[PDB]
Design a protein around this motif. Structure first.
Motif, mmCIF file in Angstrom:
data_model
loop_
_atom_site.group_PDB
_atom_site.id
_atom_site.type_symbol
_atom_site.label_atom_id
_atom_site.label_comp_id
_atom_site.label_asym_id
_atom_site.label_seq_id
_atom_site.Cartn_x
_atom_site.Cartn_y
_atom_site.Cartn_z
ATOM 1 N N UNK D 63 26.045 73.462 46.574
ATOM 2 C CA UNK D 63 26.874 74.655 46.447
ATOM 3 C C UNK D 63 28.031 74.633 47.440
ATOM 4 N N UNK D 64 27.864 73.922 48.560
ATOM 5 C CA UNK D 64 28.908 73.850 49.584
ATOM 6 C C UNK D 64 30.088 73.024 49.077
ATOM 7 N N UNK D 65 29.803 72.041 48.217
ATOM 8 C CA UNK D 65 30.832 71.134 47.713
ATOM 9 C C UNK D 65 31.825 71.857 46.802
ATOM 10 N N UNK D 66 31.406 72.966 46.194
ATOM 11 C CA UNK D 66 32.309 73.712 45.324
ATOM 12 C C UNK D 66 33.099 74.741 46.125
ATOM 13 N N UNK D 67 32.519 75.247 47.215
ATOM 14 C CA UNK D 67 33.251 76.152 48.100
ATOM 15 C C UNK D 67 34.361 75.397 48.820
ATOM 16 N N UNK E 19 36.948 55.264 30.003
ATOM 17 C CA UNK E 19 37.137 56.209 31.091
ATOM 18 C C UNK E 19 35.801 56.502 31.759
ATOM 19 N N UNK E 20 35.866 56.903 33.026
ATOM 20 C CA UNK E 20 34.687 57.368 33.747
ATOM 21 C C UNK E 20 34.914 58.816 34.163
ATOM 22 N N UNK E 21 34.469 59.754 33.334
ATOM 23 C CA UNK E 21 34.530 61.168 33.669
ATOM 24 C C UNK E 21 33.175 61.651 34.161
ATOM 25 N N UNK E 22 33.076 61.839 35.467
ATOM 26 C CA UNK E 22 31.839 62.315 36.073
ATOM 27 C C UNK E 22 31.627 63.831 35.965
ATOM 28 N N UNK E 23 32.619 64.724 36.177
ATOM 29 C CA UNK E 23 32.334 66.147 35.935
ATOM 30 C C UNK E 23 32.195 66.524 34.472
ATOM 31 N N UNK E 24 32.796 65.778 33.548
ATOM 32 C CA UNK E 24 32.665 66.065 32.127
ATOM 33 C C UNK E 24 31.320 65.667 31.553
ATOM 34 N N UNK E 25 30.785 64.514 31.948
ATOM 35 C CA UNK E 25 29.503 64.068 31.415
ATOM 36 C C UNK E 25 28.349 64.791 32.094
ATOM 37 N N UNK E 26 28.601 65.384 33.260
ATOM 38 C CA UNK E 26 27.584 66.218 33.887
ATOM 39 C C UNK E 26 27.462 67.563 33.191
ATOM 40 N N UNK E 65 19.917 78.324 35.182
ATOM 41 C CA UNK E 65 20.886 79.408 35.062
ATOM 42 C C UNK E 65 21.938 79.324 36.155
ATOM 43 N N UNK E 66 21.597 78.710 37.287
ATOM 44 C CA UNK E 66 22.583 78.563 38.350
ATOM 45 C C UNK E 66 23.142 77.151 38.381
ATOM 46 N N UNK E 67 22.511 76.232 37.646
ATOM 47 C CA UNK E 67 23.074 74.893 37.500
ATOM 48 C C UNK E 67 24.116 74.865 36.394
ATOM 49 N N UNK E 68 24.161 75.927 35.589
ATOM 50 C CA UNK E 68 25.196 76.055 34.569
ATOM 51 C C UNK E 68 26.401 76.830 35.092
ATOM 52 N N UNK E 69 26.244 77.507 36.233
ATOM 53 C CA UNK E 69 27.385 78.170 36.857
ATOM 54 C C UNK E 69 28.113 77.232 37.806
ATOM 55 N N UNK E 70 27.404 76.244 38.347
ATOM 56 C CA UNK E 70 28.025 75.341 39.304
ATOM 57 C C UNK E 70 28.730 74.200 38.589
ATOM 58 N N UNK E 71 28.149 73.727 37.489
ATOM 59 C CA UNK E 71 28.739 72.608 36.764
ATOM 60 C C UNK E 71 29.909 73.058 35.903
ATOM 61 N N UNK E 72 30.059 74.368 35.714
ATOM 62 C CA UNK E 72 31.209 74.868 34.972
ATOM 63 C C UNK E 72 32.404 75.070 35.891
ATOM 64 N N UNK E 73 32.150 75.476 37.137
ATOM 65 C CA UNK E 73 33.230 75.650 38.104
ATOM 66 C C UNK E 73 33.796 74.311 38.557
ATOM 67 N N UNK E 74 33.043 73.228 38.367
ATOM 68 C CA UNK E 74 33.533 71.920 38.784
ATOM 69 C C UNK E 74 34.424 71.303 37.713
ATOM 70 N N UNK E 75 34.114 71.551 36.441
ATOM 71 C CA UNK E 75 34.959 71.034 35.369
ATOM 72 C C UNK E 75 36.235 71.854 35.238
ATOM 73 N N UNK E 76 36.158 73.150 35.542
ATOM 74 C CA UNK E 76 37.353 73.989 35.514
ATOM 75 C C UNK E 76 38.291 73.655 36.662
ATOM 76 N N UNK E 77 37.743 73.194 37.785
ATOM 77 C CA UNK E 77 38.576 72.880 38.938
ATOM 78 C C UNK E 77 39.080 71.448 38.873
#
Lengths: 240, 50, 101, 250, 98
Positions: D63-67, E19-26, E65-77
């Motif tokens: 979670x720290x990596x996204x902050x 291509x190697x897309x790591x946040x997309x395949x996650x 439920x919280x692993x779907x909130x973190x992996x979505x903020x990484x692909x959006x960023x």
């Protein structure tokens, strides 16, 4: 926990569904009375020419490929070799959708449905996709069933071209790889030892070295070897 | 002098000539550019342009 | 026609968000089926919503994968466009040869 | 609590603790940040967004990596509260402060290998968000003094001198070397519109990858010896029409 | 073994489009996981097995439920970085020409 999960097993089969023949019917009504399958190939190819918008023509391309992949996992419906029935049809589609546009819309939509639908067996898909010869370009650009389609002798050309043109650094390590870029590096060092002014313009000779070995992609290890090799002939007078 | 020193080293020696075998057959095995054999009269003539 | 890279990626902010709202409603459903102090109809009416949202979730995961393949073909054309496509655009050719001479 | 508002309180919290830190940008390029300058709780992850909740039943260091990445991208855009020149350096100072925080708090992770992939990930965010070859040569003194941090791959103790635990087909350098070879080929294709700062950027970046890798790495010494075809000491803008009909003089 | 001209250019087109897309395949792993589990509850087959992810838990479903909130903020960023890094390469290309 083991008792209460038996409640969900009873509650799933009781009230929820009829096995869908009436709710789920995309473009095929039944198999036998409708059958007409050589002529049914054209009546779906008839309206598919006169489609303008790309959203509503790809809602149709998406629902055309979904109902086929659920139909193959059930077997012994009418005939065993139904895999050549669909594969003869799609070859007519790809040669027509390369005529009006210049893309592979019917090709790429075949890849996206063959990767996502969570009922298909993967061994059944590669047996189908091998037969169609007009989609072999889209399988090698995209998703991974072209690895099992690849020849074993042809795999040693993948392991050589991957780490030559994607991972190998593009630098030149010898004096023949750049005879032009190393020829101006030596002649700039011959010039620097024939100046009367050599301590006021030290930093004017470094900024011409970094522009020479950035323009021509010279090595950084072989370059320090050439500097120590030319400057050993002039060490008696210029060592400051 | 940089590209004449190579013609000497690649005609005479045969481990340098065998190293440039692999780098041309790996990048395209069906090779339109060809180097395959001795070229022996060009060996004695090309060593006189060195 | 052709698609612009700034709008080909702008659609995948929206195509990704229309798939995110489908995933969150399904995990809302499975939280109701997991809780111990549940009831007789709350498990019944919530499961009635389940095969509706299952069909839209699989229908949006093809579009997310189809829009990804479009950008890889589009930004390998941009990688050929760099070069001297923009070099033969300047209408000032006499001053740019007197400066280099 | 919502997971999104947990992130939004954390980015505003890191803006408080990094503003009051009295260090300049000309002193942070050469000398590293001392580990005794931050409070003892910040290096251990007891934060004010992370005490009021109890709902962190999941991962903490994922979670720290996204902050830390949302804090960087929100620090490279906003420049419109003061004059712009001081506002560019406040973007890069909050970058180099947040990149020293990953190295110092590496024992307080739940994994001493989960910082080697976080340090290469945030460093590739900086290079994309940085907008010009003039600002590249302003930042790159940070990435040349701190070069022995890149070689200690998933090990908390430093490599000695000359040793590097970096091989070219493993998890740090497997998707980054494929990505840094695109910039170095992007900058090679325009052979007409290259200034002298584009040729200095191509030197300082290619020299960085050579020191990172050993002298014997199969992708380091140009193993398949290919003679260049682009050795061109020629200007097209100095050439008009390439005449071949008046063959009079010597 | 034979190598033909069309079987060589099937190698080179696999090389370009890799291509190697790591946040997309996650992120597509999470979409692939939840579509498997809820695809069994419509049939009814849920058992204490390792073929699916989890069976039914208030603590383990709350992990997804919280692993779907973190992996979505990484692909959006990681899609906002590609927008910016191609935007200011165009202006730097144009402010050299102009």
């Amino acid at each position: 926990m083991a008792e209460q999960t038996l409640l969900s097993k009873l509650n799933a089969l009781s009230q929820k569904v009829i096995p869908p023949a009436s709710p789920s019917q995309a473009s095929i009504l039944t198999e036998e009375v409708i059958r007409n399958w050589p002529e049914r190939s054209k009546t779906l190819c008839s309206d598919f020419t006169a489609l303008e918008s790309n959203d509503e023509k790809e809602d149709w391309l998406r629902t055309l490929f979904i109902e086929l992949f659920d139909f193959i996992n059930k077997n012994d419906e009418n005939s065993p070799l139904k895999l050549s029935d669909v594969a003869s049809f799609t070859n007519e589609l790809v040669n027509h959708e390369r005529q009006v546009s210049q893309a592979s819309i019917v090709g790429k939509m075949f890849i996206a449905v063959s990767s996502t639908v969570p009922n298909i067996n993967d061994l059944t898909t590669i047996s189908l996709c091998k037969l169609i010869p007009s989609l072999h370009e889209e399988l090698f650009k995209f998703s991974w069933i072209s690895s099992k389609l690849l020849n074993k002798e042809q795999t040693t050309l993948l392991r050589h071209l991957l780490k030559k043109s994607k991972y190998e650094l593009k630098k030149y390590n010898l004096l023949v790889e750049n005879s032009v870029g190393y020829g101006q590096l030596v002649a700039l060092l011959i010039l620097a030892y024939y100046d009367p002014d050599n301590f006021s313009k030290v930093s004017a000779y470094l900024k011409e070295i970094y522009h020479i070995m950035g323009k021509y992609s010279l090595d950084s290890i072989r370059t320090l070897d050439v500097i120590l090799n030319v400057s050993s002939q002039f060490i008696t007078e210029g060592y400051k | 002098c940089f590209t004449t020193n190579l013609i000497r080293n690649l005609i005479s020696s045969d481990e340098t000539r065998n190293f440039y075998k692999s780098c041309y057959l790996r990048e395209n095995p069906l090779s339109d550019i060809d180097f395959e054999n001795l070229d022996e009269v060009n060996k004695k003539r090309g060593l006189n342009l060195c | 026609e052709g698609r612009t890279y700034f709008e080909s990626l702008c659609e995948e902010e929206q195509s990704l968000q229309e798939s995110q709202t489908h995933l969150l409603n399904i995990l809302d459903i499975l939280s109701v089926l997991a809780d111990p102090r549940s009831s007789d109809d709350l498990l019944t009416e919530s499961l009635k919503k389940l095969p509706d949202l299952h069909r839209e979730l699989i229908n949006s995961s093809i579009r997310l994968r189809y829009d990804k393949y479009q950008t890889r073909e589009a930004q390998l054309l941009e990688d050929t466009k760099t070069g001297r496509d923009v070099a033969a655009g300047v209408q000032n050719p006499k001053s740019i040869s007197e400066y280099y001479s | 609590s919502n997971t999104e508002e947990l992130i939004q309180n954390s980015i505003g919290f890191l803006q408080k603790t990094f503003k009051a830190l009295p260090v300049s940008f000309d002193s942070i390029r050469h000398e590293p940040l001392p580990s005794s300058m931050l409070h003892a709780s910040v290096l251990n992850f007891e934060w004010e967004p992370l005490e009021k909740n109890i709902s962190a039943i999941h991962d903490r260091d994922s979670l720290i990596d996204i902050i830390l990445k949302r804090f960087i991208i929100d620090s490279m855009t906003n420049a419109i509260e003061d004059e712009e020149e001081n506002n560019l350096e406040k973007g890069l100072l909050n970058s180099c402060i947040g990149l020293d925080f990953v190295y110092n708090s590496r024992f307080n992770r739940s994994n001493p290998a989960s910082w080697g992939n976080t340090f290469f990930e945030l460093f590739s965010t900086i290079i994309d968000l940085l907008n010009s070859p003039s600002t590249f040569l302003k930042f790159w003194p940070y990435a040349e003094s701190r070069i022995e941090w890149f070689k200690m791959n998933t090990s908390v103790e430093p490599v000695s001198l000359g040793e590097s635990n970096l091989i070219s087909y493993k998890q740090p350098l497997y998707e980054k070397l494929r990505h840094w070879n695109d910039i170095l080929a992007k900058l090679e294709n325009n052979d007409i519109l290259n200034t002298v700062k584009h040729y200095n950027m191509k030197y300082k970046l290619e020299n960085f990858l050579s020191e990172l890798l050993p002298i014997n790495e199969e992708s380091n010494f140009n193993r398949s010896a290919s003679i260049s075809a682009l050795q061109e000491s020629d200007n097209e803008w100095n050439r008009s029409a390439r005449e071949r009909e008046s063959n009079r003089s010597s | 073994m034979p190598l033909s001209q069309k079987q060589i250019d099937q190698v080179r087109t696999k090389v370009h489009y890799s291509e190697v897309d790591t946040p997309f395949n996650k992120y597509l792993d999470i979409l692939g996981k939840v579509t498997k589990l809820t695809g069994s509850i419509i049939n009814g087959t849920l058992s204490n097995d390792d073929s699916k992810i989890e069976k039914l838990t208030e603590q383990n479903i709350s992990q997804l439920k919280e692993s779907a909130h973190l992996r979505f903020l990484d692909l959006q960023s990681s899609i906002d970085t590609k927008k910016v890094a191609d935007e200011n390469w165009e202006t730097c290309q144009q402010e050299t020409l102009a």
